[PDB]
Design a protein around this ligand. Structure first.
Ligand code: FAD
Ligand code: LMT
Ligand code: RBF
Ligand code: UQ2
Ligand code: FES
Ligand code: FES
Ligand code: NA
Ligand code: NA
Lengths: 201, 406, 196, 395, 446, 248
């Protein structure tokens, strides 16, 4: 239980490590895209690690990079087809970032570092945990941006907008690029205050 | 229908991609074997295939490079002079190597990858390394957590080394239990207070460790050593017990262990100035060699002193040896400060810690404390406390030769 | 001409690093020093200039819907082909430079392994699919996007070197303050948001 | 209290100078300290602040008497606390109001914003200093006044509090405080509102404090129909060049008067506090691009034919050039980079004004963009110097 | 020949009369240990010992062979040590006329003397310590040589003496010293002056260069930057004109010449002038019955680059040629930072005082403000005439980026080269201390 | 051992290809429906038909909507698969396209496809309104809408913007229902058969026939909307087709 939850506030892919930041900055305007994206990253990281481990002892070292990206690319392509067949609306919103899961440093980072020279099941759990931490960052950033940028959570009204006979004026910077940078930056500050072991020198 | 096209095209791209990479590798990457030159000697030249770290090729050959961490990258004992090759010094290498040393070719061998031809200028000491497996003679307990180790030289003569050196000991995997440890009744009584015999060390894989010598060069026949048992912290039981020291402690007469030759840099200066020795725990080994070396091997007339830190009388070993040397030569003197004498000790001498006993007695009124060489080796707490006092006396770092054994 | 308006579009109006959040991991990691930052940027320019037009040729000739045969559209192979092409062409570049151009390898070839399977390269081709680019157009777009990516990362390196005098609170030092810096940079790069 | 003792140190250092003596060489020190620099900049915008309050009240009065009259005008006055408070203290609201009534009305819009900016902004400055155990610096005095002078008179107070909070915290305090950041704090706070709540800091409902009045500004009017579209609908008169130069136009409280800003700019420039290389660079960049657009021409965009001297007196260009681009911390540090830093500001402002349809003015965006490249201009300058050094300066 | 415009002449009141007069008798003389950069003394004398003129007092552990010798003969009365047992001063009461002698030579023979012969005599007499190296302002190693020796025959420090007045008396000794330097240098000897005529050496090795303009036009660092840029590979030696006179006296008479001419000046100095004294003379005794009442600070050297003369450090420094006395300004002023200063001096034009040209100011030790982070308003670039970027160089020093500081020219600088930057800094940073820290790291790593 | 590497590469490649080619090919039909049904909902929304659920949207659309192709030049219907027709592709491809002149490009649209697709709202075998899809450039993005015109060809039944990237609060208020509701009852043409719909800055008179309130603080977006109805109600848009609709 401790192993799976480790990459959440101890070796989080975005707070301690710098991995999967491109998605965390681009699909966090709504929780629906942030939620579905994280589930995909767990599906790919867990499965890519599992398959890499099984054929790790036989992978050719010369072209191991090609062999690994093929597994990830195949899985991400399948995930893209599923999102089109079901959840086409969300799939359209994610745009080119569903395919960018391939280059997501989290997927490759675990694949080379852990899926290799490891057993399948532990490597699978390694992927599940990493996505959970990656998902935690996407939820926190996505929660604040959607709530303050639109007055809604998961598309549900939580703050009636003055335009819709409400009382809350939306903040337009929450829907733009800089806000995601600030939220993660302040998110890191909070984590390293309650866990001062992560402070850099 | 389209699935057939999808399958065929999918493979054709991958096969084309790998073939281009593999085809490019043959005509672009030179697969010829690398040639490594050591000190420029044609015989010492080492030919190793591309790939792997520098220490790998050197270890197989007749030149052995000291590596306390065994390639861990955080020991600094793999410093070698790379005249040519090896690229530029890595940013991590600068952590253990100063900028000035980098200009001289000082590089971490374990951190350097052999990917092309290179030139090396390994020193004579690194070149002059011989593998020996001495037969353990004595493993008596000098103190509560200290043992005196006697080693029988396999091929006669004695290990060639300078005073204060160490021998890198390597042992295979074994399960040694603290019960097998043999202790005298004098020290066994204190052991029963905590009953450390319940521990059971399990050395899964071979390990490498260093142990300072405890015999000056003229002491031919036995490579005397002092070993301190490694145990989990009393306040932190969740730590593995001693692995190498426990294995060595478990040994007795008849057992043999490898020493991989001598190494070290804890050498005194050949000058005409006063010398100060501050030993602790296993640190008594270099002091005994240094004291023996100066008194008889060199017959130096320079003033000498010794300040060993101990807690109780039972801890204090080699007391007779120092008393004889002190009586034998007036220039050499020794004193001990008891941190916490036992009720039966009835101590009536210096009491407390040496970091204050030494200053309040000798250094405080010393005319020129800076004009002294301070050789210190002991527990980390002693080293930290003593360093602050010596700095407060205006003592240059060059005159403080710390040799902490952990 | 049309190409010039495209080049200025892909350097300032379209910014991969700040406007599309692509290549952030290396953008925030190799931004410590200007010299190394200027190095990775050039490699990104080279890889984009090679990767984008080459994938354009493959896409039109092979992966384009209905182009190869009537009723057969190999579009679902898009992701594997682009990533596979970029990965292959970068590795060979690291080899030709090392064998034949030592000085260039130590100057630009060192960063190529970082540019392998990088987000900025893949994202650039991905937009080049959702947009119709002619081969010459794709060359300019590939070149311009990498140039603009270099501008952001080189600009970040200047700010971080200036920050040697900063007194950042512990817990924000390093990654946390860098994210804020990038956000403040994104604010200044929104001055061409409305341009065409 | 130990924590409140630090704050008392700032107060004591404010009323009385410290009695500290030098602890080493140099044993004598220059008279100038950071305190005197800040107050000179603070006093340099006083002429623009006073005219701004007069201008804001004048525009509001003229528009109010042009929309309403008689009983309707009376009801409008009673509805808004800004209006009757002016009448309560002894100020008329008719079309015969004097400069005192016009100034007084403007003060009811500026003082609350400046007070809101100061209290909320100062709280963050003190909080960071107390927790991190630092002495309060005088930089906030300049930051608070400048931020309050570059916002519309109608800005909601809660939005003003947010803007100063963003600039002080996100742009300055996390970096270590005054002198330790790279971005212009006042403009960072303005950019926050610019993008967070664009409805309140743009359009035709925020630049005049007359309730129910809609009027475009000069920059907007020119972009619509060129020089001939410059009309004050609250007075029916053409906006002449001298009108923009003096400041008889709607806009931000402190930006309107190019003449008033120049007088303050001259003083700090003469005193050596404001770099003249930066100001000279801004003029070069603006003039070169404005004339370039004039020569190129355009049959669809009216901004192409705006001359340099019209760019000078419109929008926030003069205020930005004199008091924002001259921020020493966020500008370049080398003399050569200052010329380039100014030129980039001048070029960018004209570019955004003429090419970016989304925003009629670009001085705030231009300076923020230029702040990102000031360290690079210095980098190119020093590397050239390093090469000269490694050649022994040709010796 | 070289004119400087970026600089600042401090118009501090009390400039010396520029006439040499006999000084108060000096009974205590000391050697200041902390003013020799990177020096770890090895004592050759204990308290109560009797010392001759040029007898060694202590050696340097980190510069083997360099002897620090007594300026006078007498008895050692105290060996002052501060925190961490750092040698503050070695005080010697003056008594007797016993002196260690040395070999003498004729004036014409000096230029032809062997380099090792010159070195041995200079080191033995202790006069070797007059030289300092750029970089690092250290005493040159005995086994080292330089192709460029700079002679500072000018002084643009505030309240400084006029070297022409001092040198004119010792014309024969000054020229004799130049001939000795001519043989000592592997390359040239650079004589830097203010354009007025000086005694001139007839050797082609010695070159005269004129510097005109405000301070630091007279600092050796300025002269090296324009005539012989220094780096890790190129090292120059600096020596002031009075030490050059001592060099000539030593090789002409075989006796150590410890007489010095210093300017006693300052606002609180009743009759500022030039007074004859001895090396390391007690400053408390030198300024007795010459200072106005009040709490004052006595400084060895200038107000820009000098040492506070109090307690252990109350003696004339080796490289100092002036004593400046000022008031200690502890007066808190109500809104003083906001008043119009007719009597306040500044490099900026933000005070009324700059309008009254020719005004002199009764400067005190007041900081004129509190410590703040650097806000760069171009003050550094107005007083720094070298081809450098002072704002970036100073920020590297403030940040501790020693590697960056070296690239920006830190190796060309001494503490005195950054005094004007310290004077004009709005944040009240002390850059001389920061430079020394950076230079210590660069030497320790190298 | 290239023999082993090729076996792994081929073996791994074949398994990956089979899954990828099976998933994309098998799911293609479902994906096409998901996109096909997405647009149908917007048309049903502006048509006035309330549809909830995927099944209802398909059922109602196939029962009360009738896609049809039209030629802008001739203003007459043309034969083809109206349901399966990407008008945007036609506009891009020079095949069916016209590079509009600067004067004619009132809505700032680069091209205009030769064939346009409308959606007749059949009611008991009789058309009740025509939903014209129009588009024009805004301040940030290109804005697409559906305009529902009554049988007379003048009255407007409704308007919906189904794709726009304008700033929320300022320019995105084209999707505000109150603003959309303001379009019902207006007239696209005057008695002279010339476009008359006006986006009036500062609001429009109450009870007006061709006047629509502008977007507050969003003149540039409002100008784009005004431009859109100028071009698409002109001779080069639906002017020919709409004129035909008026006379049966
Ligand atoms: C140059 C040099 C000379 C030395 N000379 C001597 C000498 O003369 N005498 C001497 O006694 N020592 C000496 N040492 C120390 C030596 O390296 C060992 O620390 C010591 O021999 C004990 O060996 P160990 O591995 O069993 O204990 P260590 O593991 O090294 O001791 C560390 C502590 O952690 C515990 N521990 C054991 N295994 C682990 C593990 N896997 N992970 C974490 N904690 C663990 C140990 O019980 C102990 O409490 C020297 C070291 C050096 C570098
Ligand atoms: C101290 C402040 C700075 C001092 C600057 C010194 C003067 C700088 C002059 C810049 C060059 C002349 O600037 C000139 O300005 C006039 C306004 O009269 C413009 O006058 C006109 O010209 C263009 C065509 O060229 C017309 O389409 C347009 O209506 C208008 O801009 C000129 O186009 C421009 O060339
Ligand atoms: C000439 C001058 C101009 C300044 N301009 C600004 C400004 O535009 N905005 C601001 O927030 N602070 C300004 N300041 C205050 C301060 O320098 C600035 O906030 C720095 O960025 C703080 O490090 C200015 C100070 C001076 C001396
Ligand atoms: C020396 O100059 C300054 C002051 O004068 C003493 C201040 O007072 C403040 C802060 C002002 C206010 C109103 C903060 C209110 C909140 C708290 C917690 C004190 C600042 C920033 C300042 O620079
Ligand atoms: S996820 Fe790391 S570069 Fe995009
Ligand atoms: S072997 Fe220890 S660092 Fe290399
Ligand atoms: Na104006
Ligand atoms: Na514009």
């Amino acid at each position: 239980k401790k192993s799976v939850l480790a990459p959440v506030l101890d070796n989080n892919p975005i707070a301690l490590q710098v991995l999967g930041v491109c998605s965390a900055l681009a699909v966090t305007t709504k929780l629906e895209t942030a939620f579905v994206m994280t589930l995909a990253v767990m599906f790919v990281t867990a499965l890519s690690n599992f398959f890499v481990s099984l054929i790790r002892n036989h992978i050719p070292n010369s072209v191991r990079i090609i062999v690994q990206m093929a597994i990830i690319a195949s899985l991400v392509i399948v995930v893209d087809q599923i999102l089109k067949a079901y959840l086409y609306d969300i799939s359209k919103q994610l745009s080119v970032f569903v395919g960018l899961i391939i280059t997501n440093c989290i997927v490759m980072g675990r694949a080379e570092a852990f899926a290799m020279k490891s057993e399948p099941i532990p490597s699978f759990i390694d992927g599940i945990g990493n996505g959970l931490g990656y998902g935690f960052v996407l939820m926190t950033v996505g929660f604040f941006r959607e709530l303050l940028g639109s007055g809604k959570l998961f598309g549900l009204e939580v703050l009636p907008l003055i335009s819709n006979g409400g009382w809350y004026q939306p903040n337009g910077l929450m829907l733009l690029a800089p806000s995601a940078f600030f939220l993660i930056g302040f998110m890191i500050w909070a984590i390293r205050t309650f866990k001062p072991e992560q402070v850099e020198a | 229908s389209t699935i057939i096209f999808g399958v065929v095209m999918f493979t054709l791209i991958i096969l084309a991609l790998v073939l281009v990479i593999l085809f490019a590798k043959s005509k672009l990457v030179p697969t010829g074997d690398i040639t490594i030159s050591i000190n420029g000697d044609p015989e010492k030249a080492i030919v190793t295939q591309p790939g792997g770290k520098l220490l790998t090729a050197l270890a197989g050959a007749g030149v052995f490079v000291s590596s306390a961490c065994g390639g861990g990258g955080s020991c600094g004992q793999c410093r070698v002079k790379i005249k040519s090759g090896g690229g530029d010094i890595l940013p991590t290498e600068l952590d253990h190597i100063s900028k000035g040393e980098a200009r001289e070719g000082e590089r971490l061998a374990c951190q350097v990858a052999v990917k092309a031809d290179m030139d090396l200028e390994l020193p004579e000491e690194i070149f002059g390394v011989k593998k020996w497996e001495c037969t353990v003679i004595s493993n008596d307990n000098k103190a509560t957590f200290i043992k005196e180790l006697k080693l029988a030289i396999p091929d006669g003569e004695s290990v060639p080394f300078r005073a204060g050196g160490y021998i890198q000991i390597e042992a295979p995997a074994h399960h040694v239990k603290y019960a097998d440890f043999d202790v005298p009744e004098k020290y066994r009584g204190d052991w029963d207070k905590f009953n450390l015999f319940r521990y059971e060390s399990k050395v899964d894989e071979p390990i490498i460790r260093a142990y300072s010598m405890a015999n000056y060069p003229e002491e031919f026949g036995i490579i005397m050593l002092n070993v301190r048992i490694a145990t989990p912290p009393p306040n932190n039981p969740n730590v593995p017990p001693g692995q190498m020291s426990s294995y060595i402690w478990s040994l007795k007469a008849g057992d043999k262990c490898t020493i991989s030759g001598p190494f070290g840099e804890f050498f005194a200066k050949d000058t005409d100035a006063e010398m100060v020795f501050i030993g602790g725990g296993a640190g008594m080994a270099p002091m005994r060699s240094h004291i023996f070396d100066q008194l008889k091997r060199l017959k130096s007339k320079r003033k000498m002193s010794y300040w060993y830190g101990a807690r109780s009388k039972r801890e204090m070993f080699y007391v007779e040896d120092f008393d004889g040397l002190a009586a034998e030569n007036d220039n050499f003197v020794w004193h001990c400060a008891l941190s916490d004498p036992q009720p039966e000790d009835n101590w009536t001498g210096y009491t407390g810690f040496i970091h204050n006993v030494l200053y309040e007695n000798y250094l405080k009124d010393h005319e020129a404390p800076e004009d002294c060489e301070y050789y210190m080796c002991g527990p980390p707490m002693m080293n930290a406390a003593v360093i602050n006092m010596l700095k407060n006396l205006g003592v240059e770092e060059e005159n403080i030769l710390l040799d902490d054994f952990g | 001409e049309h190409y010039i308006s495209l080049l200025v579009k892909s350097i300032f109006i379209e910014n991969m690093a700040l406007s599309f959040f692509l290549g952030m991991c290396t953008f925030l990691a190799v931004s410590k020093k200007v010299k190394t930052s200027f190095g990775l940027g050039i490699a990104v320019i080279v890889v984009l200039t090679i990767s984008v037009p080459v994938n354009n040729l493959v896409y039109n000739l092979v992966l384009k819907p209905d182009a190869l045969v009537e009723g057969v559209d190999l579009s679902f192979l898009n992701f594997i082909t682009f990533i596979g092409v970029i990965a292959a062409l970068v590795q060979i570049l690291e080899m030709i430079l090392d064998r034949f151009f030592p000085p260039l390898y130590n100057a630009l070839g060192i960063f190529l392994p970082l540019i392998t399977v990088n987000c900025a390269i893949f994202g650039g081709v991905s937009f080049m699919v959702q947009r119709d680019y002619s081969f010459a157009e794709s060359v300019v777009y590939g070149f311009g996007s990498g140039v603009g990516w270099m501008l952001a990362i080189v600009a970040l390196a200047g700010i971080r070197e200036k920050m040697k005098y900063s007194d950042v609170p512990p817990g924000l030092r390093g990654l946390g303050i860098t994210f804020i810096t990038a956000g403040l940079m994104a604010l200044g790069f929104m001055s061409f948001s409305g341009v065409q | 209290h130990e924590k409140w003792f630090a704050l008392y140190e700032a107060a004591a250092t404010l009323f009385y100078t410290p009695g500290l003596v030098t602890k080493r060489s140099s044993h004598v020190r220059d008279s100038v300290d950071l305190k005197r620099i800040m107050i000179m900049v603070w006093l340099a915008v006083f002429p623009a602040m006073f005219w701004g309050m007069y201008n804001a009240g004048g525009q509001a009065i003229a528009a109010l008497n042009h929309l309403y009259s008689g009983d309707q005008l009376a009801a409008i006055v009673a509805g808004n606390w800004h209006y009757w408070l002016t009448e309560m203290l002894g100020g008329t609201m008719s079309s015969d109001a004097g400069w005192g009534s016009k100034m007084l009305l403007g003060a009811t819009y500026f003082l609350p914003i400046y007070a809101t900016v100061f209290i909320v902004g100062g709280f963050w400055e003190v909080l960071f200093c107390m927790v991190r155990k630092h002495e309060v610096n005088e930089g906030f005095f300049v930051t608070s006044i400048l931020f309050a002078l570059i916002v519309p008179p109608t800005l909601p107070l809660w939005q003003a509090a947010l803007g100063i909070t963003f600039g002080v915290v996100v742009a300055k305090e996390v970096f270590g405080g005054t002198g330790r950041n790279f971005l212009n704090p006042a403009l960072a706070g303005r950019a926050f509102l610019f993008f967070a709540y664009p409805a309140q800091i743009s359009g035709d409902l925020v630049w005049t404090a007359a309730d129910g009045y809609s009027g475009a500004t000069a920059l907007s009017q020119w972009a619509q129909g060129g020089a001939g579209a410059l009309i004050n609908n609250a007075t029916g008169q053409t906006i002449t060049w001298m009108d923009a130069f003096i400041g008889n136009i709607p806009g931000s409280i402190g930006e309107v008067s190019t003449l008033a800003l120049m007088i303050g700019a001259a003083f700090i420039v003469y005193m050596g506090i404001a770099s003249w290389r930066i100001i000279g660079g801004v003029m070069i960049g603006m003039i070169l691009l404005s004339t370039l657009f004039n020569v190129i021409g355009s049959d669809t965009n009216a901004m192409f034919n705006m001359p340099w001297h019209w760019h000078l007196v419109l929008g926030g260009f003069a205020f930005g050039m004199f008091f924002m681009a001259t921020d020493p911390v966020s500008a370049s540090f080398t003399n050569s980079g200052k010329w380039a830093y100014g030129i980039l500001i001048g070029v960018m402002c004209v570019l955004i004004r003429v090419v970016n349809p989304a925003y009629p003015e670009g001085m705030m965006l231009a300076i923020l963009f230029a702040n990102l490249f000031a360290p690079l201009f210095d980098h190119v300058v020093v590397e050239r110097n390093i090469k000269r050094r490694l050649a022994r300066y040709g010796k | 020949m070289i004119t400087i415009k970026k600089g600042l002449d401090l118009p501090i009141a009390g400039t010396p009369s520029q006439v040499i007069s006999d000084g108060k008798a000096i009974k205590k003389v000391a050697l200041l240990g902390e003013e020799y950069v990177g020096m770890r003394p090895t004592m050759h004398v204990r308290v109560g010992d009797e010392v001759k003129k040029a007898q060694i007092l202590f050696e340097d552990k980190k510069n083997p062979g360099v002897k620090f010798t007594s300026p006078v003969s007498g008895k050692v009365v105290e060996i002052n040590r501060g925190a961490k047992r750092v040698l503050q001063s070695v005080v010697i009461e003056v008594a007797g006329d016993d002196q260690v002698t040395f070999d003498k030579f004729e004036a014409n023979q000096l230029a032809s003397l062997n380099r090792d012969a010159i070195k041995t005599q200079l080191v033995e007499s202790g006069l070797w310590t007059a030289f300092r190296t750029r970089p690092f302002s250290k005493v040159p190693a005995i086994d080292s040589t330089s192709e460029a020796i700079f002679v500072t025959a000018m002084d643009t420090n505030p309240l400084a003496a006029e070297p022409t007045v001092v040198i004119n008396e010792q014309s024969e000794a000054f020229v004799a010293g130049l001939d000795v330097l001519s043989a000592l240098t592997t390359g040239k000897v650079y004589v830097c002056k203010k354009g007025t005529s000086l005694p001139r050496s007839q050797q082609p090795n010695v070159e005269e260069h004129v510097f005109d303009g405000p301070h630091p036009a007279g600092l050796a660092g300025t002269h090296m930057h324009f005539l012989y840029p220094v780096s890790a590979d190129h090292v120059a030696w600096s020596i002031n004109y009075q030490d050059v006179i001592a060099v000539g006296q030593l090789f002409l008479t075989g006796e150590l010449y410890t007489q010095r001419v210093v300017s006693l000046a300052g606002p609180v100095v009743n009759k500022p002038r030039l007074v004859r004294t001895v090396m390391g003379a007690s400053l408390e005794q030198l300024v007795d019955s010459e200072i106005m009442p009040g709490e004052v600070r006595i400084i060895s050297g200038s107000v820009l680059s000098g040492t506070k003369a109090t307690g252990p450090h109350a003696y004339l420094g080796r490289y100092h040629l002036q004593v400046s006395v000022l008031r200690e300004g502890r007066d808190k002023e109500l809104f003083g930072w906001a008043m119009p200063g007719k009597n306040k001096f500044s490099v900026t034009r933000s005070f009324l005082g700059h309008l009254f040209k020719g005004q002199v100011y009764n400067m005190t030790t007041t900081t004129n403000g509190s410590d703040r982070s650097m806000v760069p308003i171009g003050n550094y670039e107005k007083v720094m005439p070298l081809d450098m970027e002072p704002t970036l160089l100073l920020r590297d020093l403030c940040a501790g980026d020693s590697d960056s500081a070296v690239r920006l020219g830190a190796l060309e600088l001494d503490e005195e080269d950054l005094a004007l930057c310290t004077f004009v800094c709005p944040g009240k940073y002390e850059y001389g201390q920061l430079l020394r820290e950076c230079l210590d790291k660069i030497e320790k790593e190298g | 051992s290239i023999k082993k590497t090729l076996f792994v590469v081929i073996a791994l490649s074949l398994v990956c290809s089979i899954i990828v080619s099976a998933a994309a090919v098998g799911l293609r039909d479902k994906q096409k429906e998901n996109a096909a049904l997405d647009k149908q909902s917007k048309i049903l929304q502006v048509a006035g038909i309330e549809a909830k659920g995927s099944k209802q949207i398909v059922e109602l659309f196939n029962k009360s909507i009738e896609p049809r192709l039209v030629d802008f030049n001739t203003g007459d219907f043309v034969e083809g698969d109206a349901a399966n027709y990407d008008q945007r592709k036609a506009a891009k491809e020079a095949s069916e396209s016209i590079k509009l002149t600067a004067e004619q490009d009132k809505a700032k649209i680069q091209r205009r496809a030769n064939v346009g697709v409308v959606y007749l709202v059949k009611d008991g075998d009789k058309t009740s309104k025509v939903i014209l899809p129009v588009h024009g450039n805004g301040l940030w993005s290109m804005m697409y809408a559906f305009v529902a015109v009554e049988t007379d060809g003048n009255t407007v039944s409704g308007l919906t913007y189904y794709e726009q990237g304008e700033t929320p609060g300022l320019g995105g208020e084209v999707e505000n229902p109150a603003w959309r509701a303001q379009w019902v009852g207006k007239k696209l043409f005057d008695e002279n058969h010339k476009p008359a719909i006006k986006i009036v800055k500062g609001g429009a008179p109450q009870g007006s026939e061709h006047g629509v309130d502008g977007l507050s603080g969003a003149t540039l977006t409002s100008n784009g909307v005004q431009n859109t109805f100028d071009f698409w109600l002109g001779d080069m848009g639906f002017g020919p087709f709409l004129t035909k609709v008026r006379d049966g």
